[PDB]
Amino acid sequence: TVQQLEGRWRLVDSKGFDEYMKELGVGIALRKMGAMAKPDCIITCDGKNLTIKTESTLKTTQFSCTLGEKFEETTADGRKTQTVCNFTDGALVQHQEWDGKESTITRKLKDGKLVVECVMNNVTCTRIYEKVE
């Protein structure tokens, strides 16, 4: 259940994230910030409404969405995208679309921690998050 993803999570490990950002076309300024920020990810749900808030000194982002409904997302790197979030096959899937390109971030609960995987054109990433308190 999506509720099982609720809570404040802290990043304990990252992998492939720098390759992904490169794949998107993000420059060093943001690539360095992302590569060195150890953000907190707060996920809360209300029925079908869902909010994902990212917090760090180097950056703070946040967006809300209703499962199954498309919406305009202003990504941390400045992209406006047509995002849809849908909880399917036991994971939260955040599919993005912009300028003919696509990308999807998948968040799932595993062994007690939140495992976030991002993919774009076969280039992927894997961030592990442990619940705070």
Ligand X SMILES: CCCCCCCCCCCCCCCC(=O)O
Question: Known binding site for N-eicosanoyl ethanolamine: residues?
Answer: 41, 107, 129
Q: How many residues bind ligand X (CB under 6 A)?
A: 15
Question: What letter represents residue 93's amino acid?
Answer: V
Tokens found for residue 23? 């794949």
SS3 21: helix
Give dist(CA 1, CA 67) in Å, integer: 13
Residue 127 contacts ligand X per CB under 6 A:
yes
Lay out the site mask for ligand X across 59-78 (x = CB under 6 A, - = otherwise): x---------------xxx-
CA dihedral 2→128→38→86, nearest 10 degrees, is -30
Residue 116 contacts ligand X per CB under 6 A:
yes
Residues that bind ligand X (CB under 6 A): 21, 26, 30, 33-34, 37, 41, 59, 75-77, 105, 116, 118, 127
